[PDB]
Design an enzyme around this catalytic site. Sequence first.
Site, PDB file in Angstrom:
ATOM      1  N   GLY B  28       0.795  -1.100  -0.013  1.00 38.27           N
ATOM      2  CA  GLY B  28      -0.031   0.087   0.069  1.00 38.27           C
ATOM      3  C   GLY B  28       0.655   1.284  -0.046  1.00 38.27           C
ATOM      4  O   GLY B  28       2.041   1.411   0.287  1.00 38.27           O
ATOM      5  N   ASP B 165       0.123  -0.760  14.907  1.00 38.12           N
ATOM      6  CA  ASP B 165       0.122   0.754  14.331  1.00 38.12           C
ATOM      7  C   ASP B 165      -0.348   1.617  15.245  1.00 38.12           C
ATOM      8  O   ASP B 165      -1.242   2.645  15.201  1.00 38.12           O
ATOM      9  CB  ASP B 165      -0.967   0.743  13.123  1.00 38.12           C
ATOM     10  CG  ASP B 165      -0.310   0.245  11.863  1.00 38.12           C
ATOM     11  OD1 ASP B 165       0.649  -0.125  11.944  1.00 38.12           O
ATOM     12  OD2 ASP B 165      -0.971   0.356  10.830  1.00 38.12           O
TER      13      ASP B 165
END
Lengths: 8, 340
Positions: B28, B165
Site C-alpha cells: 500500500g 500501528d
Amino acid sequence: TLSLVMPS
Amino acid sequence: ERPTFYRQELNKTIWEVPERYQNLSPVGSGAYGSVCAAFDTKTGHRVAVKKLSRPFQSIIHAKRTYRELRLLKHMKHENVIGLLDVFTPARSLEEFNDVYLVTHLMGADLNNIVKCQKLTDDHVQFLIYQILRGLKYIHSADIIHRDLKPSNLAVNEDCELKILDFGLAATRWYRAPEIMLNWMHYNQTVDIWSVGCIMAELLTGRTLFPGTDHIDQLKLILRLVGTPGAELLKKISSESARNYIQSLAQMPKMNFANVFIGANPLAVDLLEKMLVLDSDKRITAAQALAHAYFAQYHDPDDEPVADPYDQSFESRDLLIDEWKSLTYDEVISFVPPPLD
C-alpha cells in the site's frame, strides 16, 4: 484448538 | 555484519534492502511511509517492510521518526508487534537518509476476519483476552496505543492476535468521548474504551457507535452511558466544552443487559465495566484479565509486564540533525530478537 479461515 | 543490499523500483519509489528479503510486493501507499510484503529468507516467513517517507524533512518528522523507532524497539510481547529488523542502506551518518522497518505478517486483520466468517463466543473471548493481555503490557510501560480498532488487530489461523500501528501522538467509532472532542488529556484508559467498542461489535455483529460526525457520535455514546455527572464535569478544563455539555438533555445510563440480550452475561458484565463514561472508573487491562469471562485463558503467571519506557526525550528540544543522529543511533544499536 479454535481456528479461523483466512480471507483469500 | 552488514549484508549485501539490492535496489529496485516499485510504485515509483526506490527500495534498497538486504538480499534476505525477496519477492517484495507493494502492499500500500501511505503518507507516512509505503509498505511492501516480502519473504524473509532468514526467518522463512512473510514479513512487512516499511520504507519511512521523508523521515527527516522537518523537526516534527524527525522527532516522529525517532519516537516510532524507540516505541517499536521497546515492544517485546506476543500480543504486540515486534520489530523484526530495522535497517538503512547507509554506511555512515552523513549518508544516512532512509529508514526501513521489518515486522511480522499475520495475513489478516480483524475487519477481514469478521468479513468472511462468524465468530463463536469462544473466538471472541480469546481475541479480547489477548487484546487485554497486550494492553496490560503496553500500559505497564506507560504507553497509550491511542488508536485501537479492528484494523489495527492482526489475527492468524489459530486466532492468535497482535496489536499494531500505535497512534504517534472510521477511527471515531472506537474513540473514548473525553478525547473525541479533546475534553481532557488522554488516560491509558481510552484504550479500554476502544476494547469495549470492539468487543460489542464482535459480539453483536454491528458497530456500536457508528456516528457520522463528532456531535452525532457523542450523542450516540451518551444515550448509552448517560450524560456526565457533576463530578465528571469538574475534570473538563475547557469551559466551552462544559457549557456545551450542560446544554444537553440530561440522561441516565441505560441498562446494558437489555441492549445485548443473548450475549454471554459475563461478556455484557465486562462490557459494562469497560464502557463506563468516567475514565477513572473504567476497568483496567490488568483488572479485566482476571474477569470471569476469561476464566479459561487467564494465567496470572503468564501475563507479563514491560520494562520501564523512558519517554523523557519527548520534552527535549533538538535540531533536525540531532533527532536524525539519535535515530541513526537507534538503528545502529538494534538487537534482532532471538530466532525461533
